[PDB]
Design a binder for this molecule. Structure first.
Ligand code: CLA
Ligand code: CLA
Ligand code: CLA
Ligand code: CLA
Ligand code: CLA
Ligand code: CLA
Ligand code: CLA
Ligand SMILES: CCCCCCCCCCCCCCCC(=O)OC[C@H](COP(=O)(O)OC[C@@H](O)CO)OC(=O)CCCCCCCCCCCCCCC
Ligand SMILES: CC1=C(/C=C/C(C)=C/C=C/C(C)=C/C=C/C=C(C)/C=C/C=C(C)/C=C/C2=C(C)CCCC2(C)C)C(C)(C)CCC1
Ligand SMILES: CC1=C(/C=C/C(C)=C/C=C/C(C)=C/C=C/C=C(C)/C=C/C=C(C)/C=C/C2=C(C)CCCC2(C)C)C(C)(C)CCC1
Ligand SMILES: CC1=C(/C=C/C(C)=C/C=C\C(C)=C\C=C\C=C(C)\C=C\C=C(C)\C=C\C2=C(C)CCCC2(C)C)C(C)(C)CCC1
Lengths: 41, 160, 218, 84, 737
């Protein structure tokens, strides 16, 4: 549906999806590599 | 249907209302006989009466609540404080009379009764009348304080 | 016409067109102002007819195996009361050629076909006689009245040839359906408070009425 | 016996008295409305009853409920003080 | 009275924001459009003028509210079955802290999974759900899972009903205005039948299971609830009167049911709560009373009362026509009903909060101090908010729906003709109470500082005894046997009977003394409440006009000002009066909760020893230290905040973080309250300039917040920060000790 796809492009829904994916990625990254203080490579 | 509250003097466009608290015959008689509402009497006598009544009153709180209430100097200190308060009130009255009234001008009191009858304006609203009132108030207050102190701590009356 | 607890509000719309109409509507549910949803006189009449027919089927079904069991005609293992034949397994169960939950799915599928066809007839009349359905759609065209479809399938004997006779038979059907609904309510509630078969209730009452009664059962 | 007991007589009397009062205009009803001066006023309820006085089923149910309430209250009150 | 398919179900309106308004739907020229979109979301009266459509819209949203509440209940019940130690707590309620929340270990937050007993690690909860579940006879987790499933199903049903009664069959206006039928149904069915059903559940399930639990039987060996119904022998063994069945009920031999329907009063020594038989009898009586009350109003059958007839018959020589015309106002305006209901609900919530603490209705609830404190503060705050909303919507009705041409009422007209006297008298009362209540605290502070303890208002120098309340306590302590012969003990243990109840070595309840400090704090409460009432009533009464702005009704209910003329006209609308009264509501509720907390910690709660000596938490310092502001600052704020500031490195560090977070949020609100819009609009102009330089200027022109929006943001952040600070402090203090 075109009208359903239009509602998914509104600012709050897109922001929520983007930030949820971002937070998931950051949480997983910190889970894999915990307690990082310096860049060792 | 019977109604109790009425517009003031039958005029509904004046910002007041007539209620039993204001227009009861007992309350109307009681207020008209107070010394502050006797517009045909010398202001000096009304001031003397007001001063006596207020000066007799002021002794009690100062005597019973003062810092020296639990000592032998309670009554004298209370009477002295009451006299000082009476002096301050007299100063305030004198200042108000000086600032508000000007010499030579006629009275500003209303000259119409509630029923429309014409009457002489009260002389309390002039400089001379207010000065007489203030002097009488001072004299009456001092006399009342003295009388209260005499009764309380010169005659061993079984009070309380 | 006779009236039964009629009211001025009820008589304003119950003019006697429907079969078995006595003007009885104290709550005014068939009031034709602001009709909608499932509150609608036509839908209510259709539901009453369907419920009466099902209760008529169910009233005799819940008692038929019982009376022959006491009559020595069928094996006693099949002469069970309606509440123990497997409807409520905690109350008792009987082993069939398949487990109860397997029978339930087949029953649901067949009844779904039947009831969906009936509902689609109701929504758009005359529709079931158009699409090919094993060549049986010729006789499933209906008659324009949802509760009385007729046709070679539902009216094989051709009863009710005369309009007055049809009116009489409709009245008898309505009366019998109401009586069957009352009997089914009696079945349920009697089974609730006595715990034995309704035929056993009748036999106990006929044994003596003063010792087996509401005053002694409650 | 319970049938001849005082409770039976009291409750039957209460119900009968309430029904009689409702029927013969001694109490308000569907066709009788009491005003602010506690005076009954004639009214039409629009319900067919087949009764000469117009006593409908709702009036009968209300009168029965009031009679039962009064009878239960009287029975329990007399039982508490040990009178019955 | 319904309409078939009024509105088509489609996604078309989803892609066009602001469809409910003509102006908003035009497009976002500036950023004010986005803010205006949310502020007018639920103002159905502004969208359309048809009363039927507004009623239909209002009817549907309540279904969504009910669905949300059902989802919340489902979550609460599910968490207690999967992530809780309820079964372990059931075998030792006095030594195990309830917990129903666990945390994933990611960034070191697993320290919050503190030890609570029963071999469990989690966050200790203070909502009191464990006591509710115990009082209902719940033993295993399967029952909780079934309850969660049922709540989910009910939420789905509510959502479907909400969709249906708006898109398929919407009731007409004549359906909504049947107030007599609605009252009859909500009285007889919603309340009476619910009370009857709960009484039946308590009689058949809660009583035997709770008796078995109080006997000390292992919860896993207690028969299941259905075993007491199928096997009447068990109930007959527990209660011999059950062997007779329902015969005594129908023969009016109700005295046989005295074994499980009592009139005892007081608390159960084993658990510390009210007797469950008393609760069952109470619910039965309440069900009967509510069932009788639901047959008053007239319906299709003639018998009953007409609300209009009742209203039209009340008038007096002072009030003129009286209550004539009030029926039409309340059946045409949604705002007046909302205001009245909000006020009544807030008052009821405050009453419930006051009643729950002194009459503990749940087992092992009096000895759970954190739960008691949390429930009290929560319900008080909810009541205050509802009370403020009542006045807000009363002002809204006054501004919008008032029309003397077609909806004249004599009582409303007479009130508006002497509002000056009411406001002036309330002002004088507020000033007098403030002088003679707070002034006594400053006097005590000055005398203490000067070194004259004998000239203070205290129990040792100048007593101000609350003789009236002590008389009530004495009368209630002597009520049984004289004025309540059927009672065995008093309604509450706080009246001054002299008896003390101790459960598990802790003090549950005991008589509460009243002295000089209670006098002062009660008068402080009265002063604050009077000021709040003054503000709200002044806002409501002058909503349409005043001597300053004669045409205030034309400007609307929510407008910022009327210019700098007449010396200044800032915050003259009725909205600003609610904005101002929220602060005073916050002040009053904070003072009340501080009084409650200190008094209970100092004079009630404590521990008892073998010899029977009570040692309170703070040692009974409320009487001599609360009479000065320095005492409140030192012995309450400074002394009791050491728990929250020393919570770092333990399972209570979340409260320590919330303390500073709420400090920051509260301090952040002063930027919006102390400043104005012009400065921020002028500052934005410079920021926009550099964006234009780099071709990053948006087409949606940035605009500063409006005056009303700024005030709302300020008050919201202020309230949030203050309440969060108090919440963190209270929980951190009470969980540790
Ligand atoms: C309990 C089982 C479980 C397991 C083993 C994982 C494992 C993983 N998740 Mg994950 N996740 C789970 C449950 C689980 N998740 C749940 C219940 C949710 C919520 C619905 C998520 C939401 C989630 C998000 C939002 C993201 C992950 C990501 C990842 C990957 C992180 C490594 C990475 O980025 O390398 C690269 C990925 C791989 C080598 C394989 C994928 C890793 C394979 C991240 C990921 O895949 O990054 C692209 C990521 O962004 N997960
Ligand atoms: C500008 C401020 C600022 C900066 C530069 C950092 C920088 C950092 N934070 Mg951090 N943090 C900040 C604000 C900031 N934080 C705030 C405000 C919070 C509270 C919400 C946190 C809460 C936080 C957590 C909970 C964690 C970090 C961690 C870290 C480190 C990241 C390690 C990694 O792999 O990614 C990194 C040094 C991680 C770490 O290991 O730190 C050593 C980690 O676990 N931060
Ligand atoms: C013969 C008439 C009669 C008598 C002698 C009583 C006597 C009594 N009633 Mg009573 N009552 C009556 C009719 C009567 N009632 C009726 C018609 C009703 C309306 C249904 C009630 C409704 C009623 C209530 C609601 C209560 C009493 C109560 C009482 C007792 C008083 C206890 C107290 O002081 O409180 C007392 C034994 C009270 C009681 O028993 O409390 C212990 C009580 O609460 N009565
Ligand atoms: C509406 C109220 C409510 C609230 C505030 C919570 C809150 C929470 N639930 Mg939850 N839950 C609820 C209702 C609720 N639930 C209902 C109705 C059900 C179904 C009966 C569940 C079923 C459920 C499960 C099965 C789990 C939670 C978990 C959690 C926690 C982690 C949330 C998370 O990671 O989601 C992230 C958000 C997503 C959308 C994914 C969190 C405290 C988890 C937990 O505590 O694990 C330790 C967990 O495993 N919940
Ligand atoms: C709406 C609530 C409700 C419901 C559904 C029931 C339902 C039931 N009750 Mg009951 N009961 C109730 C309220 C209720 N009761 C109240 C308030 C009382 C106190 C007067 C009783 C007192 C009571 C007794 C004394 C007995 C029942 C019994 C029964 C059962 C047989 C009838 C039935 C399951 C009977 C039973 O347990 O039989 C199995 C029985 O002997 N009930
Ligand atoms: C039964 C309760 C009830 C109901 C049905 C209503 C209904 C209504 N109120 Mg109302 N009100 C209530 C209680 C209630 N109120 C109470 C208790 C108060 C006192 C506090 C008020 C104070 C009030 C005011 C001052 C106004 C209304 C207005 C209105 C109308 C428009 C509502 C609107 O647009 O809001 C839109 C809703 C929002 C914008 C949501 C607000 C967001 C809250 C405040 C912040 C929550 C913070 C949260 C925890 C942080 C998470 C954020 C997240 C994104 C991360 C509507 C008829 C307005 C009106 O009639 O104007 C003509 C109006 O001006 N009400
Ligand atoms: C991509 C968009 C964008 C770009 C390129 C810039 C660029 C700039 N901003 Mg800025 N700003 C933006 C969005 C943007 N802003 C937004 C949305 C806001 C409102 C929150 C602000 C608020 C803001 C202020 C208050 C100030 C600047 C300032 C500045 C300048 C100093 C550099 C800097 O880091 O400032 C710091 C930049 C920020 C603090 C902005 C926060 C980051 C935002 C949230 C990113 C959002 C991007 C947006 C979602 C794009 C979506 C892309 C998507 C459609 C694909 C620089 C030219 C400063 C200046 O020199 O004054 C002119 C200054 O004082 N900005
Ligand atoms: C003064 C005593 C309390 C008041 C009292 O006597 O109440 C009763 C008194 C007379 O009421 P009426 O009998 O005229 O009307 C009663 C109404 O219910 C009729 O709708 O009320 C007033 O006159 C208004 C009082 C306003 C508030 C006055 C200050 C308090
Ligand atoms: C918790 C919860 C839940 C659940 C709930 C439930 C489960 C409920 C139930 C309920 C019920 C289950 C109810 C019932 C009821 C009943 C009734 C209400 C009845 C009545 C009756 C009557 C009233 C009668 C009467 C009578 C008389 C008077 C005379 C004659 C005889 C008789 C007996 C008939 C859920 C999941 C939702 C979720 C949330 C929470
Ligand atoms: C406060 C609150 C809450 C809660 C609440 C609740 C819990 C409620 C409940 C309620 C209820 C719980 C109700 C109920 C109702 C009703 C009912 C329950 C009914 C039933 C049944 C019936 C109606 C029946 C009937 C009958 C029968 C049986 C048969 C025959 C006929 C008759 C009619 C008799 C919360 C916290 C959450 C939130 C806030 C607020
Ligand atoms: C002469 C005559 C007659 C008569 C009859 C009669 C008069 C009968 C009646 C009877 C009746 C018509 C009765 C009724 C009743 C009713 C009721 C009774 C209702 C209800 C009630 C209730 C529901 C209540 C409840 C309760 C409870 C449960 C508990 C507490 C107490 C009370 C009581 C409140 C006839 C028609 C044959 C024929 C013609 C002639």
């Amino acid at each position: 549906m075109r009208d359903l796809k239009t509602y998914l492009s509104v600012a709050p829904v897109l922001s929520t999806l983007w930030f949820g994916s971002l937070a998931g990625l950051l949480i997983e990254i910190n889970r894999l590599f915990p307690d990082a203080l310096t860049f060792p490579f | 249907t019977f109604q109790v509250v009425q517009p003031i003097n039958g005029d509904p466009f004046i910002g007041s209302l007539e209620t039993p608290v204001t227009s009861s015959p007992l309350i109307a008689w009681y207020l008209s006989n107070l010394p502050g509402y006797r517009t045909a009497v010398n202001p000096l006598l009304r001031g003397v009466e007001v001063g006596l009544a207020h000066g007799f009153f002021l002794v009690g709180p100062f005597v019973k609540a003062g810092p020296l209430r639990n000592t032998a100097y309670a009554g004298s200190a209370g009477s002295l404080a009451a006299a000082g308060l009476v002096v301050i009130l007299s100063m305030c009255l004198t200042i108000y009379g000086i600032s508000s009234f000007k010499e030579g001008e006629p009275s500003i009191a209303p000259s119409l009764t509630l029923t429309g009858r014409k009457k002489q304006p009260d002389q309390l609203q002039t400089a001379d009348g207010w000065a007489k009132f203030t002097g009488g108030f001072f004299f009456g207050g001092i006399s009342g304080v003295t009388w209260a102190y005499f009764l309380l701590y010169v005659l061993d009356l079984p009070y309380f | 016409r006779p009236l039964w607890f009629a009211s001025s509000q009820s008589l304003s719309y119950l003019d006697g067109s429907l079969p078995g109409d006595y003007g009885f509507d104290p709550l005014g549910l068939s009031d034709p102002e602001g009709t909608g949803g499932f509150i609608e006189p036509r839908w209510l009449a259709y539901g009453e007819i369907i419920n009466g027919r099902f209760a008529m089927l169910g009233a005799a079904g819940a008692i038929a195996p019982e009376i022959l069991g006491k009559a020595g005609l069928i094996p006693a293992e099949t002469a069970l009361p309606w509440f123990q034949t497997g409807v409520i397994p905690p109350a008792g169960t009987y082993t069939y050629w398949a487990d109860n939950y397997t029978l339930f799915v087949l029953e649901m599928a067949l009844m779904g076909f039947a009831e969906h066809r009936r509902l689609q007839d109701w929504y758009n009349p005359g529709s079931m006689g158009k699409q090919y359905f094993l060549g049986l759609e010729k006789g499933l065209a209906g008659s324009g009245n949802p509760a009385y479809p007729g046709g070679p399938f539902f009216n094989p004997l051709g009863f009710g040839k005369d309009e007055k006779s049809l009116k009489e038979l409709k009245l008898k059907e309505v009366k019998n359906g109401r009586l069957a609904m009352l009997a089914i309510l009696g079945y349920f509630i009697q089974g609730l408070v006595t715990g034995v078969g309704p035929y056993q209730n009748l036999l106990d009452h006929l044994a003596d009425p003063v010792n087996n009664n509401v005053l002694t059962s409650l | 016996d319970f049938i001849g007991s005082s409770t039976n007589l009291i409750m039957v009397t209460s119900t009968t008295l309430m029904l009689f009062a409702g029927r013969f205009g001694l109490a308000p009803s569907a066709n009788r409305k009491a005003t602010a001066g506690l005076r009954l006023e004639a009214r039409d309820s629009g319900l067919q009853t087949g009764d000469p006085a117009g006593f409908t089923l709702a009036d009968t149910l209300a009168c029965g409920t009031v009679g039962h309430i009064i009878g239960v209250g009287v029975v329990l009150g007399l039982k508490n003080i040990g009178a019955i | 009275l319904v309409d078939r398919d009024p509105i088509k179900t489609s996604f078309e309106e989803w892609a066009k924001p602001g469809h409910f308004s003509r102006t908003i739907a035009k497009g976002p020229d500036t950023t004010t459009w986005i803010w205006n979109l949310h502020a007018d979301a639920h103002d159905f009266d502004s969208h359309t003028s048809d009363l039927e459509e507004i009623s239909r819209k209002v009817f549907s949203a309540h279904f969504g509210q009910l669905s949300i509440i059902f989802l919340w209940l489902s979550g609460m019940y599910f968490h207690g079955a999967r992530f809780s130690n309820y079964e372990a707590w059931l075998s030792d309620p006095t030594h195990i802290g309830p917990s129903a929340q666990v945390v994933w270990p990611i960034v070191g937050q697993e320290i919050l999974n503190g030890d609570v007993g029963g071999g469990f690690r989690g966050i200790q909860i203070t909502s009191g759900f464990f006591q509710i579940w115990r009082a209902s006879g719940i033993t295993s987790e399967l029952q909780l899972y079934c309850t969660a499933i049922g709540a989910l199903v009910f939420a789905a049903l509510m959502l479907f009903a909400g969709w249906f009664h708006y898109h398929k069959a919407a009731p007409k206006l004549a359906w909504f205005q049947d107030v007599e039928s609605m009252l009859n149904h909500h009285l007889a069915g919603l309340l009476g039948l619910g009370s009857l059903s709960w009484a039946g559940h308590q009689v058949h399930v809660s009583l035997p299971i709770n008796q078995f639990l109080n006997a000390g039987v292992d919860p896993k060996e207690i028969p299941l609830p259905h075993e007491f119904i199928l096997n009447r022998d068990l109930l007959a063994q527990l209660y011999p009167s059950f062997a007779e069945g329902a015969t005594p009920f129908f023969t009016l031999n109700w005295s046989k049911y005295s074994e499980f329907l009592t009139f005892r009063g007081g608390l159960d020594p084993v658990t510390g709560g009210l007797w469950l038989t008393d609760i069952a009898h109470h619910h039965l009586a309440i069900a009967i009373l509510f069932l009788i009350a639901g047959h008053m109003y007239r319906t299709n059958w003639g018998i009953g009362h007409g609300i209009k007839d009742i209203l039209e018959a009340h008038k007096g020589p002072f009030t003129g026509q009286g209550h004539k015309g009030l029926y039409e106002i309340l059946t045409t305006s949604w705002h007046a009903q909302l205001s009245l209901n909000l006020a009544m609900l807030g008052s009821l919530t405050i009453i419930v909060a006051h009643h729950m603490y002194s009459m503990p209705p749940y087992p092992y609830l009096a000895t759970d101090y954190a739960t008691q404190l949390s429930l009290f503060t929560h319900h008080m705050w909810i009541g205050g908010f509802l009370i403020v909303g009542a006045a807000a919507h009363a002002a809204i009705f006054m501004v919008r729906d008032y029309d003397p041409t077609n909806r004249y009422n004599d009582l409303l007209d007479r009130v508006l003709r002497h509002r000056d006297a009411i406001i002036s008298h309330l002002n004088w009362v507020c000033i007098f109470l403030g002088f003679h209540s707070f002034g006594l605290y400053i006097h005590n502070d000055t005398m203490s500082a000067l070194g004259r303890p004998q000239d203070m208002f205290s129990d040792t120098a100048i007593q101000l005894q609350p003789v009236f309340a002590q008389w009530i306590q004495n009368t209630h302590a002597l009520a049984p046997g004289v004025t309540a012969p059927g009672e065995t003990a008093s309604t509450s243990l706080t009246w001054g009977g002299g008896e003390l109840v101790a459960v598990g070595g802790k003090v549950a309840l005991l008589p509460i003394p009243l002295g000089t400090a209670d006098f002062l704090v009660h008068h402080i409460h009265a002063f604050t409440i009077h000021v709040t009432v003054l503000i709200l009533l002044k806002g409501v009464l002058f909503a349409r006009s005043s001597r300053l702005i004669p045409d205030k009704a034309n400007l609307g209910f929510r407008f910022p000002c009327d210019g700098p003329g007449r010396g200044g006209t800032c915050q003259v609308s009725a909205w600003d009066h609610v904005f101002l009264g929220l602060f005073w509501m916050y002040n009053a509720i904070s003072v009340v909760i501080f009084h409650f907390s200190w008094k209970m910690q100092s004079d009630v709660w404590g521990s008892i020893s073998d010899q029977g000596v009570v040692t309170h938490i703070t040692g009974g310092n409320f009487a001599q230290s609360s009479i000065t502001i320095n005492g409140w600052l030192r012995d309450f704020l400074w002394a009791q905040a050491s728990q929250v500031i020393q919570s770092y490195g333990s399972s209570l560090s979340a409260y320590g973080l919330f303390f500073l977070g709420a400090h920051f949020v509260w301090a952040f609100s002063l930027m919006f309250l102390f400043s104005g819009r012009g400065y921020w609009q002028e500052l934005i102009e410079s920021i926009v300039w550099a964006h234009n330089k780099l071709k990053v200027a948006p087409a949606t022109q940035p605009r500063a917040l409006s005056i009303i929006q700024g005030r709302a943001v300020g008050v919201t952040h202020y309230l949030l920060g203050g309440i969060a600070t108090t919440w963190a402090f209270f929980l951190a203090r009470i969980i540790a000790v």
